[PDB]
Amino acid sequence: AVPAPNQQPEVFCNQIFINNEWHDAVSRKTFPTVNPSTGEVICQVAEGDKEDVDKAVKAARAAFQLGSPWRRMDASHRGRLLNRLADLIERDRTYLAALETLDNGKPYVISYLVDLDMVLKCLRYYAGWADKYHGKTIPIDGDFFSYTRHEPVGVCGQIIPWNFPLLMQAWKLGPALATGNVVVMKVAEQTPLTALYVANLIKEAGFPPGVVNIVPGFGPTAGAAIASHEDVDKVAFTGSTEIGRVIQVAAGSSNLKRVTLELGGKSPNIIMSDADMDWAVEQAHFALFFNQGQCSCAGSRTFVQEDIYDEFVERSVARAKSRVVGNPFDSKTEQGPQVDETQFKKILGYINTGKQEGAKLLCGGGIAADRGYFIQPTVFGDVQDGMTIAKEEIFGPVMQILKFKTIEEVVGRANNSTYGLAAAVFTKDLDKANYLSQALQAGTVWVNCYDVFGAQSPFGGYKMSGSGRELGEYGLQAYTEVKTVTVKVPQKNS
Amino acid sequence: AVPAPNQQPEVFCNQIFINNEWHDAVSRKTFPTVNPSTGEVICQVAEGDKEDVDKAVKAARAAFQLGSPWRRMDASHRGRLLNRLADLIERDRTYLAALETLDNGKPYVISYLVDLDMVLKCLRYYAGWADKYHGKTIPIDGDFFSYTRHEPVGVCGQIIPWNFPLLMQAWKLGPALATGNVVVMKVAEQTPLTALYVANLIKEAGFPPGVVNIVPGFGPTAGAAIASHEDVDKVAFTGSTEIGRVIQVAAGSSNLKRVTLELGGKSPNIIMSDADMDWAVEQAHFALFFNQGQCSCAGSRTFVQEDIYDEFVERSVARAKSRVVGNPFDSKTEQGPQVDETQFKKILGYINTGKQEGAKLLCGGGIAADRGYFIQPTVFGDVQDGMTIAKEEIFGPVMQILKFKTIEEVVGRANNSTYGLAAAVFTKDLDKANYLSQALQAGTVWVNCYDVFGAQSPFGGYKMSGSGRELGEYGLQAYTEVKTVTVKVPQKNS
Amino acid sequence: AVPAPNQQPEVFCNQIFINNEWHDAVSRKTFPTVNPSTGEVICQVAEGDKEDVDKAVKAARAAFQLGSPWRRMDASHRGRLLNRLADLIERDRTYLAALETLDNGKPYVISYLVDLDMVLKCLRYYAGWADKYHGKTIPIDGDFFSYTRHEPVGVCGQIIPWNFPLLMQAWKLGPALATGNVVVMKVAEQTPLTALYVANLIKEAGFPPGVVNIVPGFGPTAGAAIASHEDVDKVAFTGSTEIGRVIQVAAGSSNLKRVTLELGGKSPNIIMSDADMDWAVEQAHFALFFNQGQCSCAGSRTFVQEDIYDEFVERSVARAKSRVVGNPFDSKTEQGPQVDETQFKKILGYINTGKQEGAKLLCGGGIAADRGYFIQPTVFGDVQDGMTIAKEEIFGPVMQILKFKTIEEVVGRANNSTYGLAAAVFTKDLDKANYLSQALQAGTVWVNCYDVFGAQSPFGGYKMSGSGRELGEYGLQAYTEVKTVTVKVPQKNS
Amino acid sequence: AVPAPNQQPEVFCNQIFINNEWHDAVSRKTFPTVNPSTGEVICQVAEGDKEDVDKAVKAARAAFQLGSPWRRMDASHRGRLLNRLADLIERDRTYLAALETLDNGKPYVISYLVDLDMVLKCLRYYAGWADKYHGKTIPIDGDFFSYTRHEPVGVCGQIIPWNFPLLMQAWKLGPALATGNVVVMKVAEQTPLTALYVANLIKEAGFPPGVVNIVPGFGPTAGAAIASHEDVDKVAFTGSTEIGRVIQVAAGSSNLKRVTLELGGKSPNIIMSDADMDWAVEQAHFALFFNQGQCSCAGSRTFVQEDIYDEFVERSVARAKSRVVGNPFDSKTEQGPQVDETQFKKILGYINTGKQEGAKLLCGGGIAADRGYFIQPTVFGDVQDGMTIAKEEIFGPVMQILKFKTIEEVVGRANNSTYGLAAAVFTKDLDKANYLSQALQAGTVWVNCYDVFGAQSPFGGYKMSGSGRELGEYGLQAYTEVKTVTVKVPQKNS
């Protein structure tokens, strides 16, 4: 059951958050954030730039000083603070879900049941790691006692995208805070509002000032200031592959800060002829269309074995034509608008390219409403590997269906990509499932499902889909600096 | 390639091994060991008893003293010694395989290609663990540094059976020595010879005196003396469920030594109607008949789905009738004799029991040769769950085939046992494989295979099939005593 | 800050708890529990025996059936329920602390600030483990996929003592519930009340019926029924070394259930000449006198280097004479009564023995009040290793001070014990601290502190102080049954 | 215990190694490598450039194809191959130690007893990891089975320096090969020879062609070609902080390959007034002067507490004045030449700067012989933090001694560096040791020792000394690509 929304939630936080206080930008500039369902401005937001980032980094560094409240805090108590934050978000769940829908466009039912549930589960998962990520005692040769300390990496710059604003904030804050780091976060200009409200909850939860600082603003200004900063120890970036390159170059060109990247995808979803047809059709639809198609790991190359191709396509088209596009606050709506004008235009561009290059348009193909950034669910059949829509990340409700004959053929075609974020296989056969899950070059392989995320299981890219992993125990690795301490002892014994 | 065997290998070692030297029993008693293919005495062996065990325990305790060569030795160097021991066993592989066949009865080709290969792999695997089983540094509350040391448990009594004499010795020595323990081993009275030769190789490898001591002799004398010893810290026993109970009671009645047990089985091998028939028949044959049926994990309840039952049984009877029983030094031999007269009689008793209780005798059922202890490969059909031959471990070449209808039914029937050592499922279906491997109450579940052991993967029982695990990283747990050290520090920081 | 206690709290729960309901004993018998500060009966409690244990085990087995709510529950949700339980205990903290004082005798300020705090920290720590105790994927040889599942051991019998009633309950329930086991718990006859109230909170928190069952009653009746039960998979026992032997024998004589034991101690507390004198005197006092001396790990052999002996003894005696013995609800009280008349008499017996065998009585030595079980803080000087008071666990406010000269001497004397639960070293010297922490044969070594427990760091015995470990990640091992699944695959690749 | 060297060892390998074959450079160009003891050319070496790297990367990629001999090889067998390689290096130890001395300049006794020993220990350690770096099975929410595979990262570019040619090769090849990667290694132009002979032994050991490829040549040609290559998945670079920046920028600018960096240092060695003087002096001397000062972790800021400063400096000067500089094949020689003329001149430049900026020249300060690149052991006293010789890595036999008063002062001064590779503390006091080891911002902290490396314990930088760790279990992390497989199952149970 979903509690009724407030379809026009008040905005309470719209400034830069440093040392648990709200600041205007040094410049006093602000930028609009827009409701993509109407095209109207919600409010102005402080436009942070290099000077605001510098204030935030200094606050983070101070909070990280040896002997500070955050450094001296018991690891178990960091876990208590993460659990308190989750409880505050749960108290404010309908507000945050409605604000998420207002600013991003996704259906309120999904913001409520999916995004907010996933945020809670991620924070509560990482609360549990705070006092369990042990270092080692090590049986080195000779008369020595050797051990490692797992220390925090330090001041962590965290740059996140607009597609799942709250969830991406939680994927970053969970592991960083569980391990005792401090954060300077740059939220997406398209969707800054929910993360700023969460900062108020961070203060309410009792995190020391300077442990989390949030600088809304643009990428080449505030984002680049983080990535190039001389006193930021680590940057974690989620966004496009194009900008990932910019981040890695900025790290190398500045202070050799540690880098992890979660980038784009063109994930293959492989339907073998023995798959359960009804389930495969529904999951392939979800795999592509979830979140207005705005998912890094979207199943955007649907490979279907030739003996079931015609039926699969018929059913897929029927399901796409039935998908309800509308006001994301209406309970019947399955698909809201795209996040903004830039994305709307890019997706229409890709649709035009698909038409021009001779893919078979089977449904949709155009705008879905006269106001707001709504696009019809669009399906192309008879897609070929060299087509632009088979290669480039579209990030909208545009499905590609490709036909194949053999399992060996489809492995090669699935893997012939510079992306490698996710993939899936639908089959009833044990051996085909094991053959494909081993052979696919992707960070997550789903078998008979898609978009199954768990705070316990890592996620991230092969190839140019990124480096490092988020979620699970693995998500702690990039937030830890390892120190070996090797001590002379009188006489080592086993 | 298998090198030609010496069919009458010389015996060099037949005494008690303490402090790297050979000793008679205090009583000067010896016992004969018999070649089960001919029924003739091979030689006599020192008959160790309580006073010999007491000498061995004192030697091991002395080798374990703080400051001793074995306690000071670098962990990496324990790994080098295990690797040297494996190289010496490899040098003497053809000799050891023939001596194993002479004393135990198994085909020389199998001693050579299987037993000795698995010994080498077990020792080389554990050599690699010697310097890698780390303790932890722990983020405890307060101004403390807390960590754990993984220390050796100490003097380990290790009692092993006769069915895989060299391999059982290696499964015990590998983890115990990798972790810096010292050992008093009691080898089976039926097959003492190969383990005693390996003691010569332990000295040759360079292990300090007293690190491994071996006492051949009987169970209620030397075995019980180890189990009840006031200065043995840990006992690892492999053998019958009946004697496991005796060991656990001895431990509780003496000094509360730590105990692990690897006991009997009545493991179910489940053939679904979609299995590959030819492979399932061959694997079900192997699963039961391997090693003259003398395997704790033998697939001794073969459950076969009703639609494929008649064909599976026809094929199984044909394969059992074709199985070549004979001199284990002849390369054509698939099945040697049972290990001794006691086991021979017990198996004849169980064959008669199956006949008396109305199981359908489909082939075999009698004595296979004049000399030695050879039994025909025997297959019973239409076996029912309440039959004694369906419940009790037979430990010979006697196959039980049961019919079932549904996957839900077979889970309940397979699990309705007080044993729980292993199980298998043959199916092409991903979901049936996952359903059954989850639901079966067994320490190892094989899927489309049987008797697949790896030094890397743990093995051990549910229920009355044992407690604890051998092999893998898990095999190190029982050989480690954990010490927490918690140190006051001036000011704890993350 | 400590809230004012209800000095005569009401009792709401005094029956057997099975399937989330309250039951009389089948026999309808009850037994009294006494307030040790007054010697008066608080109330009657249902007297559970074998028949009530049988009902509880059947309930636990049913709750453990494959497909049950508790088996199907997400691991993360088990963590949520443990966190809910902790929140309910915190809500009822003032009541539970007063009830603990009423039934056990410990000072209310300690119940509130120490026991209840530690209960909350233990449950919250293990809540975090619920979804983090991973099995392994294992690179076995050959064309196979091999992995382990960490499954619950099953029906766990848990038998606990009276010295820290709520904390001992939490140390058992935390790991068992985090790993998905079900429990039949036998609480101490001397202190049943607080654990029964916590059962009401387990129901309130939402644990499925049958997951936790609690049977108050006596040892040889209800305790033995659990230890010998044919359908209990695992027993975890905390109590005397004498009864540990009984439990281990019961397990071996019944169904080979898995066993862990947390037993007695006679722990050495070593004060080197270079210790900080004031700190060492205060910590040595705490080490022995904490919880009316009723701590398994009490520092009951205080070894003091000869050059500082006279001053340390003078200061220690002054501290003992200043220790306020009285009503445990009075804020000034440092020491309450002993738990019952049996213990009261036994401690007085040991004080008599100490006098008879030639130890120097420095202070105390008798009863401290004419009502309730109060004993004077008692210090014996010039104690020798062979004295009964230097060997046997007294479990009361009776301190032994022994003199030593050298570091080798004290290691050897500390280790000449069949106990090995804990030890401590007070020294400023790095090399002395490392030499002694390595050389001492004890499950926990404290350096410049004592009785520093954390849910993160394991605790348990060497030698006859126990086997297995509680707390930390280690505390999950005995609650896990390991299953290997090994699957044939078309072609294994790295 | 050192075999007499061949002082003019023959060179057998001087070409590019690709697919287990020797190749000239495509250009046919060669470059000289010089014997630094004489300044004379040993031989010419193939001058690899971009086209040679391209051939190497293609060969590595082919060897990494799914289904190849290296991809299908059992993990345990990778370990056997590493052990065989170590055996071959041991067989050729005397030759390799002499060749190392000839090309690098370090004393032969040290090549033989230290470098070659450490190479053997590294490879044998990693051999043991090959089949033990498990992935996880993960208790995700819902009806799923989720697990991770630890797969190889793929084609690994490895760029190494000249200071420990064989050891740096081993630190790279050990973890990369244990985890099943393939390698394109670029050895330092100053010391290519020993790594090329090791390639011959890699072929001899049985590694499949293309698994290890070695391209000698210069940095901006062959090194840059690897760092910028579009089909190299990971680069591991050891060298100067300056070139580390170039590598990270190349990775970002090309294909977003994974990067680890092991860079320079200016490590503080802190001597407290309570240190053992004789030991601290000798260890401080070793800390700085080991390997002609050519060690990334050299203790090049020796901080000495004011009370012991004068004595420490007097003893340090006596030791530096007696250090034997000479022919590295002479057993009396403690210090050989610097590796080449460039380094020789740089070090003399630093000595000049030290004198100019007002450090007190206490001994040495000039050239030590008329031929070869020999420099006198040089000690500067009264060094201050702002002096060039206190900030910049000198990488030669030039010691800086700084005075301090308090432990708080020295933490701040030690940590006021953009380097953070190592540090050490000399003290007898437990609390000072723990205070400093926690507070020092360095990847390794030695206590009462220096330059204690073990294959078991990780090593790497904080700050601009690098990112990632080599050695230990940690050394495997950067060579692993993690894949999550999440499988729908009929009904998940614990």
Ligand SMILES: NC(=O)c1ccc[n+]([C@@H]2O[C@H](COP(=O)([O-])OP(=O)(O)OC[C@H]3O[C@@H](n4cnc5c(N)ncnc54)[C@H](O)[C@@H]3O)[C@@H](O)[C@H]2O)c1
């Ligand atoms: N952290 C460690 O474990 C470690 C170990 C040894 C040496 N070092 C450091 O190494 C340095 C000394 O070694 P060096 O003089 O060989 O260092 P360097 O940076 O000059 O060269 C190291 C390697 O990189 C190559 N290289 C040079 N320019 C390159 C370019 N533009 N692109 C790609 N590769 C290039 C070189 O040819 C060589 O193989 C010191 O700073 C020392 O501290 C660090």
Ligand SMILES: [Mg+2]
């Ligand atoms: Mg953008």
Ligand SMILES: [Mg+2]
């Ligand atoms: Mg027997």
Ligand SMILES: [Mg+2]
């Ligand atoms: Mg009692």
Ligand SMILES: [Mg+2]
């Ligand atoms: Mg250079």
Ligand code: NA
């Ligand atoms: Na918006």
Ligand code: NA
């Ligand atoms: Na025999």
Ligand code: NA
């Ligand atoms: Na009571």
Ligand code: NA
């Ligand atoms: Na050279």
